[PDB]
Curated annotation (Swiss-Prot):
It is a multi-pass membrane protein. It comes from Severe acute respiratory syndrome coronavirus 2 (2019-nCoV). The gene is rep. May form homohexamers. Interacts with N protein. The chain holds residues 1025 to 1191 of 7096 of the full protein. Responsible for the cleavages located at the N-terminus of the replicase polyprotein. Participates together with nsp4 in the assembly of virally-induced cytoplasmic double-membrane vesicles necessary for viral replication. Antagonizes innate immune induction of type I interferon by blocking the phosphorylation, dimerization and subsequent nuclear translocation of host IRF3. Also prevents host NF-kappa-B signaling. In addition, PL-PRO possesses a deubiquitinating/deISGylating activity and processes both 'Lys-48'- and 'Lys-63'-linked polyubiquitin chains from cellular substrates. Inhibited in vitro by GRL-0617. It catalyses: Thiol-dependent hydrolysis of ester, thioester, amide, peptide and isopeptide bonds formed by the C-terminal Gly of ubiquitin (a 76-residue protein attached to proteins as an intracellular targeting signal). Residues 1-167 form the Macro domain. It is found in: Host endoplasmic reticulum membrane. This is Papain-like protease nsp3.
Length: 167
């Protein structure tokens, strides 16, 4: 039993809810919140920009030190950093950004990072400003993640289409 509330159960391990991931993380304080990161951990917009704003830019400061030490992430890769005031940890995961021409096949690799954590609060990878079809992203999530994932879809209209169209 966990403290996530109001989700629809898509599968044995995948749940979905119309919610602002920022407000969800603040309420639940999950062990792991997933960020829709880029390889530079530049959290300028989308989910990343909003999560960073909620940390008063502490996420960006920590991320800049991480990049200075380690260099950029790989597309499809991840790193674990602090969750600041939002969660214990933040799993920064880089899904492909179609608006950069990045290979969409890497979306499965991106979701595989979730399997290293027993329970996660997450957005749909490569959705929003990363340019992928959120319906496809949900399918890859369900077919790749085996740990317990609580998906937050900010857009209510998009949420209804994902649920109604889910096979
Ligand atoms: O896939 C991630 C989606 C992308 C999206 C945004 C808008 C319309 C359609 C798709 N973004 C978010 N999901 C959950 N919480 C969020 N907080 C801020 C952004 C955000
Ligand atoms: Cl977005």
């Amino acid at each position: 039993v966990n403290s996530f509330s109001g989700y629809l159960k898509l599968t044995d391990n995948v749940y979905i809810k119309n919610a602002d991931i920022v407000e969800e993380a603040k309420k639940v304080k999950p062990t792991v919140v997933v960020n829709a990161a880029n390889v530079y951990l530049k959290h300028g917009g989308g989910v990343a920009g909003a999560l960073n704003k909620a940390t008063n830019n502490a996420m960006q400061v920590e991320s800049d030190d991480y990049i200075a030490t380690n260099g950029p992430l790989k597309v499809g890769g991840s790193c674990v950093l602090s969750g600041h005031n939002l969660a214990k940890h933040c799993l920064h995961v880089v899904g492909p950004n179609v608006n950069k021409g990045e290979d969409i096949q890497l979306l499965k690799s991106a979701y595989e990072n979730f399997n290293q954590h027993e329970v996660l609060l997450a957005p749909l990878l490569s959705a929003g400003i990363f340019g992928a079809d959120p319906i496809h992203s949900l399918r890859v999530c369900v077919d790749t993640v085996r740990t317990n994932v609580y998906l937050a879809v900010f857009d209510k209209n998009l949420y209804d289409k994902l649920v109604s169209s889910f096979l």
